[PDB]
Amino acid sequence: MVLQAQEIMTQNVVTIRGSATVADAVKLMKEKKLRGLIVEPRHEQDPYGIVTETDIVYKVAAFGHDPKTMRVYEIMAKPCVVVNPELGVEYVARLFAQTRIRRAPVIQGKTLLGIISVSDILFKSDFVEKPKRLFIEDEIEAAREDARAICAAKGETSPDCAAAWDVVEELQAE
Amino acid sequence: MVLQAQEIMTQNVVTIRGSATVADAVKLMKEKKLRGLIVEPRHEQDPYGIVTETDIVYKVAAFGHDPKTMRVYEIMAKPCVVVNPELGVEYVARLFAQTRIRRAPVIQGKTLLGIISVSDILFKSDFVEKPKRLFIEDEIEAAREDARAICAAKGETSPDCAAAWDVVEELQAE
Amino acid sequence: MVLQAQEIMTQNVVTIRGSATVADAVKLMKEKKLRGLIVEPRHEQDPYGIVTETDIVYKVAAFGHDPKTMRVYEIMAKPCVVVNPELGVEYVARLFAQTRIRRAPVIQGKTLLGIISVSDILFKSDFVEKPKRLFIEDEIEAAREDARAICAAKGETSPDCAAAWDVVEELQAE
Amino acid sequence: MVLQAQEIMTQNVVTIRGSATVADAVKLMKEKKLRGLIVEPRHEQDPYGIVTETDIVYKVAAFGHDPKTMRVYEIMAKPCVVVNPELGVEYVARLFAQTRIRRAPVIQGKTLLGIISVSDILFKSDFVEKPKRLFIEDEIEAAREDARAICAAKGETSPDCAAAWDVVEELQAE
C-alpha cells in the first residue's frame, strides 16, 4: 500500500479552449487563484494540453507580446507527460525531475481524473514520514538475488550462503 | 481515424530484471539485435522501466566502468514517459521531441501493450502521405471560433461575417 | 513610469537556517502555505539563498531520501539570481526566462526588500493592458538613429530624410 | 574579510548602443582587444546589457549572417545576471557556474561599477591560497548547531555534549 498518484492529485480542474486568448487565460487564472489550466480537447481523439503561469510569463510577458492577440494554443504544451493514477508518488516526483515539469495530468486511458503537482507532492505525500529510499532498496533486492544464486549453487548450509545474506543484513544496517 | 500509437507500436518486447548485470543486458541485446530492454517490474505496484543502448554507452562504456559488476537498475530510466495507446502518432512524435526521448512504452492503465520508437514513427507512420500540419490546423480552428462570434454579434448576412469566413478561406489556401 | 519590480514584489518573506532539516522546511511551508523560503544568511558578508518546493521534490522526494536527516543547505540555491528593485517587470520576466527561474529575491545593495515570482508577474503586472513589445520598440529606435544620420548626411529637406522617417512611420503602423 | 567582487572586477568598460551594427561591435572589440561590450542603456530606467565575442560567433558568424546589417540589440543579453559589489568571489564563481555565464556587470543599485569575468576570478582571486571549501564549512556549522541543541537538552557536562563537539572536531580534521 504505497501512496498513489490518485490519492494526492487535485480533482478540480479548470479548462480553456486553445483558441482563447492568453488574456482570457490570465483573466481566468487570477479570478480563480490558479497556476495551470487544462486545454480542453476539441474532440475525443485529441489529447489533453496544459498552459502554466510560467508558460505565460516566459513566452508572452518576457517579450512584451500582446496577450489579447495571442492564443492559448501558441503557448500550451500538447501533448503532455501524463501520470497514471496508480503510479507511486515517489515515482511521480522522479518523473517530474527527469522531465523538468512541475505538474502533469492524471489520466486513465484518455479520461482526465485530475492534476498532480509538486505542491501536491510536498503537502500531501508521505515522503517525510516514510522515505522510500529507492536506490538503497533496489541495491538490497539485488543482494537478495545474488544470495539466492549463491545459496542454490553452494547449498543453504554453506558459509558462502550465510555470507550472501549477511551482505543483505549489513546493507539493511546502514 | 488519425493513426494511433497502438497501430504502429512493436508488440514484441524483451525484458530483464533490475538486478541483472549490464553485461547480461549487453549479451541479451546483441543476441536478439535490440536497442532497448524493458526492465521487468518486481511486482504489480512497481512501474515499468527501460534501459537503452545509449544508456549503456553513455553511462558504462564512456567511463570504462565494468559491465559485469554494475546492475541494470543503476542505468535504467524508471519511471518513464509513457504513451497511451490512442495517442495520435503526430503527438507521440511531439512528445518525444519535447522530452528528448526516442522510445516509450505504450501502456493501458499499467499493462504494457508494446513499445513505440522513432523508427516505428519513421517507417510505419502516415506522416509523409498525410502531414497533419498541427499549428496551421489549430490557427484555422481559431479563425472559425472568431467567425462564429463575429457572425453571432453582427449577423450572418453582415459583410463582417462574410469576411471572417474569408479569413478561414485565405488561410485554407496557403 | 514603467512598472518596477518593487511595485509588484511580495514584501513578506519567511526564512530558515541552512542547518535546519528539509523536514523543518517542509513543515514550515505547509503550515504557512508557501512555495519558497529564504535561507537566512549566517552573517552580514554571507549572501541570501533560496529553497523551493521544486528543490525539495526534485532533490529529496524523487530519490526517496530522508528529509529528517538532510539539511536545507544541501538543496538550496546560494547565491541566487537577484533582481534590483527598479528593474522593469518586462525585464524581470525576461531574466526569469533566460535563467529558467521562477522567483528571485529583490535586493538593494545586500538588503532583502522582498521576493518577486512568476505569479507576481502574472497577477500584478500591466503586461496584459500595456504590452511593451520590446524587440519592436528596439527596432524602431534604430530606425530613428538611422534617420538622424541620413538627415544629417543628406539634409532635413532631402527625400532620403523624409523616407528614413517614413521607415519609422511604417514600422509604427504594424 | 573575504575577497569581494569589487576588489577584483575590471573598472574600465567600453560601451556601444543597441542600434549599432554587429560590424561596429566587431570593429570596436578588435581595435581594443576585447571580449565583451556593455550595451549602453538608452536612459535611466533602462537596464544594462552585454554582447560577447561568443554572442557574435554563435549568432552571426555561425549562420554566415551579415554583420553590417544586424544590430547589437538583436544579439545582446538584456537584462543580465548582475553581481552585487560585496558578493564574495567564491559565490560569484558559483553564480557563473549555476547560470553558465562567464562575465557579469557589477552593479550598485543601477549604477555600473565594472565587470567581473572568469579571468578576473582566475587571475586575481585568492582561491588557490585560501580555498573556502563551502559545503564542508556549511556541514561544520550544522554540526555546531546540533551540538548547541544537544548540550542545551542534556547539559554541557554530558558525554553527549562532549561527543557532539567531537563531531565538529572530527570533521575539522578531514
Add this chain to the structure above:
Amino acid sequence: MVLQAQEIMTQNVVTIRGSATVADAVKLMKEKKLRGLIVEPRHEQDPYGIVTETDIVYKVAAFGHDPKTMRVYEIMAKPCVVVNPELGVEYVARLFAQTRIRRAPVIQGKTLLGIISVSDILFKSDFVEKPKRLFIEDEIEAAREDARAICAAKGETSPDCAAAWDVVEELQAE
C-alpha cells in the same frame, strides 16, 4: 593495442544530397533499413553532414510538416562532430556522451572512412571483457608521478619512496 574507432566502424554508408526532400530521405531509409544518411558534400571544400531518423521525427513529424516540400538541408547537422580513425573506442563513447550524439562520421583528413554509432560500440567493442576504467587509471598514473618526485627528492631507499609506491599498490588493489 587498444581497440580503435576504425576497427569497429561501419564501412558502408548511404548518401543523399542536401536538396533532396525529407520524403526522399525517408523513402531511402525505409528501403535500406537505415537510421542515418550522410549528406553528400557538393564539392571538395564542403564538409560532410548527417541526417538521422530522430532529426526527421523531431523536426518534421512532430509538427506535421510536409516531408515532400522540406529539404534535407533544412534538418541535417553540418558540420558534425567527427571521430578520427585511431581514437580509442572508450574515448568515442565519451565523446558521444559529452556531446549527446549517437553517431559520427569517421574521417581521415576530410575523406570519409565510415560511420561509428552507439550500436557499433555496444556490439563490437571490448568494453565488457576489458573495462578500461579511465579515471582510476588516470588516478594511478598520478600516484606514479608523485612517487617519482618523492623518490627523487628523498631517495629510493627512503621509507617515503617505499610508501609512495605503496600508494600505487593500494589503488591497484581496489
Add this chain to the structure above:
Amino acid sequence: MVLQAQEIMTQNVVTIRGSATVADAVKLMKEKKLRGLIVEPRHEQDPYGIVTETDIVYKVAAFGHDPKTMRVYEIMAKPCVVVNPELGVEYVARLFAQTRIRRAPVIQGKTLLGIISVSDILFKSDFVEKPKRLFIEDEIEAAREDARAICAAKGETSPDCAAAWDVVEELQAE
C-alpha cells in the same frame, strides 16, 4: 578559396600533464596570459585534451575546492571536439554553436597543428566582409536542382524552365 581553420588558428600552444595540480595550471595560465591549456597525451595512442579557465572556475573555484590537491585530469575535457585543418571558418563557428564550445584543437590525423577559438574567429575571420549566408546559399542550390529537373522534363525552351531559373534569380535578388 573559402577561409580555412588552419589559416586563422593559433599555432603556439602551451601544455600540461594530466597529473599536474589545478594550481600548477592556474600558475601557468597567469604567467603566460592564457585561457586554455592542452593536456599532453601520455603516449601516441592517447587523445589530446583541454582544460579552460572556465573549467577551473566552474569546477574548482565555484565549490571552494583546493587547487593544490586536485589534478588537471579531474577537470579537463578528453577527448574533445576537434576541427580538421581545412574546415571553413563558417563551419567551425557553427560547430562551436552546436556543441557550446569556444575552442577546439586543430588536428591532422592525430597531430596537433594548433588551436582555434571564438576570438580567432572574431578577429581573423572574413565573416564581416564576406558573409557566406549558408542557409540562403543552400536554398538557392536547391532551386538550381529543381530547375535542372524541370528543364530536363519539359525542355529548355519551356516557360516552366524559364520560370524555374527565374526562381533562382528572384532568390538571388533578396
